[model samples]
Target chain A: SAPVVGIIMGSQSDWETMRHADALLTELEIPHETLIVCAHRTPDRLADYARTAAERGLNVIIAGAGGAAHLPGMCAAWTRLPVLGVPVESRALKGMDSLLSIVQMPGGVPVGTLAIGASGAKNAALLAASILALYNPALAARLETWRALQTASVPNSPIT
Target chain B: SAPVVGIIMGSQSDWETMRHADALLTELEIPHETLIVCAHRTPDRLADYARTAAERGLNVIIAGAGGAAHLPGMCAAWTRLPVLGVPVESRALKGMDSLLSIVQMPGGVPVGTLAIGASGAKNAALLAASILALYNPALAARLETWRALQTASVPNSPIT
Candidate 1:
């Protein structure tokens, strides 16, 4: 199957966080691609990638970055594709800077932002899968099954 | 006496979140000022305001923004003063995006980030006051008092 989602990060360092998205996508049997596209370092490439994402067969875009993280918002600016932002935790301030930069788009554009670090990255993939599942009922069933398993795995009480 | 902290946000819409910081600072009897300083719409203004913050008698800064929130990070870039960021809850993504953008700063610069929305804003003021309290004994006492009250207010068990 052609890739349905594009998971891009600002730097290769972000793979540590973005990989969570990749893992979830893989588990769900969702075809997705990962790339390095820094907004500040390579603005032209970001613009090109975002603008052509739809034609390139990507339904969703998950952009992850840390510290002045601008990749997600810029991608959303360039395309109407639903962008999910994952804030990679940084050494100095954790992922807070990454979170704010991606979530805080102005009036027109939008990016469905997830949590910081691994959780956020995982949710980004889930969210993307959910978005795709809307059109693919088979995928939706798989998603529901995954969610049910996740629910079933939770313990009733906290472990000491 | 001049204000020790400057509480700035990208837009008036942020007042709802930033006000938590304002109220906390007020409650703690910490002098501070509030203003709108949109990072994208008013880049020059941000530079001017941040560059002159220290000389203007401001000891700390609490900047809030949502959706591509750049105000806090940009504010930190222009000044050496300690900055705290609050990610306001956005319409689409909640405050997750807001939180990451504000918290992830590169090396050599820092923006102490708090939780999202009201909690983050409230904490920004508390953090700023804490930074100031290092020198002001009276403020430190007030902070301790506030903290003790908070601790006292927490219930031992969660109530549905």
Candidate 2:
């Protein structure tokens, strides 16, 4: 199947956190491609990858990176397609550094940023699904079911 | 005494949130200034303010903004002084968007970002005070006392 969503991270190490996004997308049966695109170390690779994302048939991009994470913002800078960012927790700042780097893009380029860590990674996939669901009615219904189950599954009280 | 800290935000709407930073700085007796410096609209203004901050006797810059927050990052880019960012909550994504925009600055330029909304605003001031307290013994003593009082005042449990 053709990949519609692209998941990119800063480095191979980021796979530890970005895997959550991958798992979620897989669970939802969404076709996606995951890759490493460091905005600093390999600027040219990032430039080319982001520049070609749209023509490559990628509808949305879920980019996750830690400390100085530029994948999402730079990706958004190149493509007009909606880009969602996940802040992979960093050792020094505990993802605080990573969060601000990706989210605070200039006004002209917008990168929708998610929470830090695994929760954010999971949410990015869910957000990507929601965006795609706008056009794919079948996926939209599946997403509704996912949300309904999530709500219904929450316990009213904490365990003793 | 001359102002030692400068707190800048994107617009008037941010005042509602940045006021907490201003109030906290005052409460701590830290001389400071607060103003609206829209990064997108008044970019040159921000660059000038940041570039001249050190010469103006400003040791730290606490920047707050909502939606495509380039204020903190842009400020840090121009100034060597430490910059702390507060993510003023936006109407659409809450402060999630603002948080990312301010926190994810490049490695060379760092913005020590805090939580969202009033809490973030308050923390940014406290952080600025801490930075200054490193050299000002009087302010350091005051900050220690403040922290001790806060620690001593925490309740053990919630009321039934």
Candidate 3:
């Protein structure tokens, strides 16, 4: 099956964060691919990837980056696909900077921004799966099952 | 008298969010200035502003921006002054992207990131005042008074 989701990050370093998205997608049995595409170092690649994303059969794109995190917005600028952004925690500021950069799209372009670190990456995958589930009933059932399991796993009270 | 703090943002539209920082600084009686400093549109201005910040007698820099919010990090890269970042609420992601972009910095650079939107902006000013208060006893006294008042103002229980 052709990959329906594209997960792109600023560098290989982001794999630590972006992998959560990959993992969730795998658990949900959603076909996706991850790639390294830096906005600052590889602007051309970002442009090409964003431009061809939809045509290549990708229904969603998740872009992650740290400081000077421009990958998500730049990708959104290039493509009309629903783009989701995950802010990988950087060395100094944790992941706050990445979150702001990825979430603050101007009025026109939009990237569904998620929380910082691993949670954001995981949610991005779930959100992407939800988007796709709008069309595929099988994936929808899987997503609902995953969500139900998640809800059940939560404790009613604090352990400590 | 020279201003001790500088509050800068990416665009004029950000004034709605950045004004909270301005208001808090004012409440604390801290002298500050607000300006539009788009990192992408005015890279030269950002460089000049950051490089000259300390010499100009600005003790702290509070930068707020949305979507590729490089203002805080870029400013931090150019100057040794303590910088605080506020992630303004954006149209699409509600400031999550802005938060990450402002908070995440490479090693050797730092931007103390605050919460998203108005709360973050207010905290940025408070943090700036706190940094300045390390030397200014009078301002320190004022900050403590304000904090005490805030503590007292909180309700004991949730409101209906």
Candidate 4:
């Protein structure tokens, strides 16, 4: 199957955060490819990858980066496809800086911002699926079932 | 004038986040006090402080905590006063965990959740003032003026 999604991380060090996106795509049976493309270290590569991503059969791109995490916004700038940004956990400011850098983009260019860190990464995957599910009826049905199971799992009261 | 706002942090480290609330309160000319109290490290102190906060002339409480941040929620539980939670940037999950932990409370326990980190903290202070301004007409007018000036400052375009 041609991969429909691409998950790009700033560094191999981000494998921990990026893996969640990979796992979710796997569970949903959506083919996704992961790559290391640093915005600061390899701007040329990032530009090339993002420019050609949509034409290369990728419908959506999930970019995760920490610190001065400009990969997502930069990718969004180059591509027309929906871009989801995961603010990876950072060493100093705990990814708050990353979240602000990613989410607080000026108008015109928009990156669908998720939460922060791991859950954010997972949510990014889920949100991506939700977006794709809009067109794929089989995926949409499966997503509905997943949500129903989640709602059913919640207990009425807290355990004492 | 008596202090009507209580600003508390889970640890001394949280001063960076809570300082935003203090600066915002200063701008609003709201009388307030700050304290260091940890939910996990010193639950007893937190309980004592919260139980008497209202009687001590405090109308609203703002708390910032990182990681598995339970300080704001725990304080809300102990007091009847309205509590606003600032999910301070955490080391592990960048306070996304804190944001969810604070926002996703059980019914009956309400904590007004804000944006994560400093922006959230600053908004907490403003929200607290807004809540108090319900009874203070002069402060209400000041807030209106501040908001108007903000709206006036937006340019027609990002750079032009």
Please name the candidate that would achieve the greatest DockQ relative to the true structure.
1
Candidate that would win on lDDT: 4
The segments of candidate 4 whose C-alpha lies over 4 angstroms from its true place after superposition are A158-160, B1-160
Give the alpha carbon lDDT tens digit for every residue of A1-160 in model 1: 7999999997878998899999999999999898999765555587689889999989999999887887787677678789888988877767666666666678677788899899999999999999999999999999999999999999999979
The residue pairs that clash in candidate 4, if any, are none
Please tell me how candidate 3 rates in CAPRI terms.
incorrect
lDDT values, one for every candidate: 0.84, 0.84, 0.84, 0.88
| Candidate 2 collision pairs | A90-A95, A100-B103, A100-B104, A101-B103, A101-B104, A101-B105, A103-B100, A103-B101, A104-B100, A104-B101
Per-residue alpha-carbon lDDT of candidate 2 for residues B1-160, written as tens digits (9 for 90 to 100):
8999999998888999999999999989999998989765665587579889999999999999886666786677678899898988988778777876677665666889999999999999999989899999999999999899999999999999
lDDT of 3 by residue, A25-140 (tens): 99999999989987655555776898899999999999888876877877887788999999888777686666666665566678899989999999999999999999999999
Ranking 2 against 4 by DockQ, winner: 2
TM-score against truth, every candidate: 0.56, 0.54, 0.56, 0.55
Misplaced by over 4 Å in model 1 are A1-67, A70-104, A108-160, B155-160
How does chain A of every candidate compare to the true chain A by TM-score? 0.96, 0.96, 0.96, 0.95
Superposed by TM-score, candidate 3 places the C-alpha of residue A77 at a distance from the truth, in angstroms, of 14
* Candidate 4, A80-116: lDDT as tens digits: 9999999987888888789899999889999998867
Error of 3 at A43 (Å): 17
lDDT of 2 at A139: 93
- For candidate 2, the per-residue lDDT at A62 reads 94
- Evaluated at residue B48, the lDDT of candidate 1 is 82
Query: Candidate 4: deviation at residue A69, Å?
Result: 0.6
